[PDB]
């Protein structure tokens, strides 16, 4: 009859702050991420289609004029089952369309974090060959993989609403280290074969 309330993780819980940078050859910005809600996909029911994470981005001094730019983001957690590493095997619900990418994109981006074994990689398998009979469940592995996408502009981090050009088209591949709290990310834009790099630690 009843459904699980889920769990919160030491480094994936409401109220948690991270700080760091987003950078690339021509970009460097100080950024802060705050986790607002968590609904980990521990099982498959209706709630597992709702966002698994919601939070805010804050960019410091985006323009010479704007000292604080704040966006609201939503995201989903890889659990290798209903939400495998290959986004194209995600459920067919339309609200997940903004998180899709080609198989090779997902594959290369997940690999680039550098925490997978060297063995058994296949572009045609729903977890790219990285989740097997002897793998631990996602919450019990050291590294957790997520996809984040911003979808609203806000005024302050207290969250009132005030994003549709090309500079908003992609999404973040995200990797959390549960042992140290460090967070790495790649902002991927479909139409450009370069990314931006997100690096955060807990505040």
């Amino acid at each position: 009859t009843y459904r699980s309330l889920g769990r919160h993780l030491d480094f994936l819980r409401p109220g948690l702050r991270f700080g760091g940078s987003q950078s690339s050859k021509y970009t460097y910005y100080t950024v802060e991420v705050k986790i607002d809600t968590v609904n980990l996909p521990l099982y498959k029911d209706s709630r597992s289609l709702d966002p698994h994470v919601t939070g805010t981005f804050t960019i410091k001094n985006l323009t010479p004029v704007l000292d604080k730019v704040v966006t609201l983001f939503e995201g989903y957690v890889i659990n290798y089952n209903q939400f495998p590493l290959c986004s194209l095997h995600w459920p067919a619900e339309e609200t997940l369309d903004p998180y899709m990418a080609q198989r090779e994109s997902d594959c290369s981006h997940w690999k680039r974090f550098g925490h997978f074994g060297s063995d058994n990689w296949s572009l045609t398998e729903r977890n790219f060959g990285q989740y097997n009979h002897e793998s631990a469940e996602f919450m019990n592995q050291r590294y957790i993989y997520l996809k984040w996408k911003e979808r609203f502009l806000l005024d302050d981090e207290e969250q009132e609403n005030l994003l549709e050009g090309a500079s908003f088209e992609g999404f973040y591949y995200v990797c959390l280290d549960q042992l140290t709290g460090s967070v790495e990310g790649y902002y991927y834009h479909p139409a450009c074969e370069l990314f931006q790099k997100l690096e955060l630690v807990p505040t």
């Binding site: 050859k25 021509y26 970009t27 460097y28 910005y29 500079s167 088209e169 902002y187």
Partner: peptide, 8 residues
């Protein structure tokens, strides 16, 4: 999101 090339 895709941030400006503030070092360009």
């Amino acid at each position: 999101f895709w941030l400006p090339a503030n070092l360009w």
